[PDB]
Every structure is written in structure tokens, then in C-alpha cells.
Ligand binder design. Structure first.
Ligand SMILES: CC(C)C[C@H](CC(=O)O)C(=O)N[C@H]1Cc2cn(c3ccccc23)CCCCCCNC1=O
Ligand SMILES: [Ca+2]
Ligand SMILES: [Ca+2]
Ligand SMILES: [Zn+2]
Ligand SMILES: [Zn+2]
Length: 166
């Protein structure tokens, strides 16, 4: 595992999150259930706790976007970069954006598995950098293992606990 330079991390017991926009590929309830599932995958290993808010600012802002969307990291259409997220901090810090040009799926169709992608991006939102281990969720590319049958590897778990303790 690797952390971001200077090891930024949320310095609070509770971290809020808000899903600002949705994809047209999935029911809204599925995105909510899956973001929750994803946050709690990391949540179970550490002392942090998460709370969803539906208006205003939250530490982690989640949204879907195609192309340019204000943050200077324009998406690029289907394929290539699937999504991106930012190290803990204020403003853009902690946010996770998913490329709406991708065919997102919960796993029952051909496309990009949103739970797998969200676990990876929220790992970045919590402070995780990339892994050299092809099997870790934090590995830089999608599809080495099985998007529909996976779990955090010992490498992912070691890194998150190095950042927030057990
Ligand atoms: C892990 C994931 C959920 C989030 C990451 C983004 C991130 O690290 O947060 C991601 O999108 N990685 C690219 C990395 C990537 C692979 N290639 C690329 C070609 C161009 C640009 C990027 C890539 C080769 C071609 C395949 C393109 C489709 C799959 N893309 C990827 O795996
Ligand atoms: Ca933020
Ligand atoms: Ca893309
Ligand atoms: Zn963005
Ligand atoms: Zn990444």
C-alpha cells in the first residue's frame, strides 16, 4: 500500500458524505446502498464512522460527471479513466467523481462495477494511495481479480489501519 504525500487523513471520529448527483444507469437507491456498502468495507477496519447528509457541505462529496465539471480533471468519455477522488482535506479534498460516460452496473449486467469502483475511490477519499499488489483493491487498474467477488486485501487493510489505527 502507499499513502498520499504527508499522510493526510480525516482528523475526526465521524466523516460526513453527500451524494450530490446520480448516474442514469442505476436506480438511485442502488447507488446509495452501494456507496454505503463501499464506505463500510473500509469502515469495518478502523475507528471512523460515516454519516450521510442530503444538503449543504459534507467532508466527502460524491457525484457523477461527463467531461469538464469544474475541478480541472475533465473526464474523457467511455473507458480510460473511470473515476477520480482526492486526498482528505477541505474543498475538493475527499471528493469522489465518477465518469458518467461509463456504463455503470451493480454486477448484474456488462459494464463497470460501481461497488468495486466506489471502494477504490473512497479508499482515496480516506487517504489511500495506490498499491503495487495486483490483487489489492487500491491497485491502479480495473479488472485484475473479479469485480463481482472481492474484498479488501491484507495490503489494503494494512494501509488503512496504518492511517487510522485498528
Ligand atoms: C481502478 C479504477 C476503478 C479507477 C482508476 C482511477 C483511479 O485510480 O482512481 C481507473 O480508472 N483506472 C484506469 C487505468 C487505465 C488503464 N488503461 C488506461 C488507459 C488510459 C487511461 C487510464 C487507464 C488501459 C485501458 C483500460 C481502460 C479502462 C479501465 N481503466 C482503468 O483501470
Ligand atoms: Ca470535500
Ligand atoms: Ca472515462
Ligand atoms: Zn472531477
Ligand atoms: Zn486510484
Amino acid at each position: 500500500y502507499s499513502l498520499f504525500p504527508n499522510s493526510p487523513k480525516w482528523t475526526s471520529k465521524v466523516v460526513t458524505y453527500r451524494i450530490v448527483s446520480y448516474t442514469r444507469d442505476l436506480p438511485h437507491i442502488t447507488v446509495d446502498r452501494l456507496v454505503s456498502k463501499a464506505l463500510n468495507m473500509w469502515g469495518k477496519e478502523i475507528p471512523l464512522h460515516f454519516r450521510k447528509v442530503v444538503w449543504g457541505t459534507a467532508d466527502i462529496m460524491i457525484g457523477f460527471a461527463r467531461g469538464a465539471h469544474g475541478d480541472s480533471y475533465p473526464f474523457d468519455g467511455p473507458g480510460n479513466t473511470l473515476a477520480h477522488a482526492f486526498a482528505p482535506g477541505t474543498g475538493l479534498g475527499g471528493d469522489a467523481h465518477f465518469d458518467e460516460d461509463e456504463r455503470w452496473t451493480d454486477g448484474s449486467s456488462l459494464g463497470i462495477n460501481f461497488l468495486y469502483a466506489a471502494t477504490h475511490e473512497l479508499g482515496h477519499s480516506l487517504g489511500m494511495g495506490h498499491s503495487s499488489d495486483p490483487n489489492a483493491v487500491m491497485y491502479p487498474t480495473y479488472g485484475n481479480g473479479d469485480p463481482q467477488n472481492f474484498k479488501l486485501s491484507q495490503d489494503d487493510i494494512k494501509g488503512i489501519q496504518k492511517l487510522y489505527g485498528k
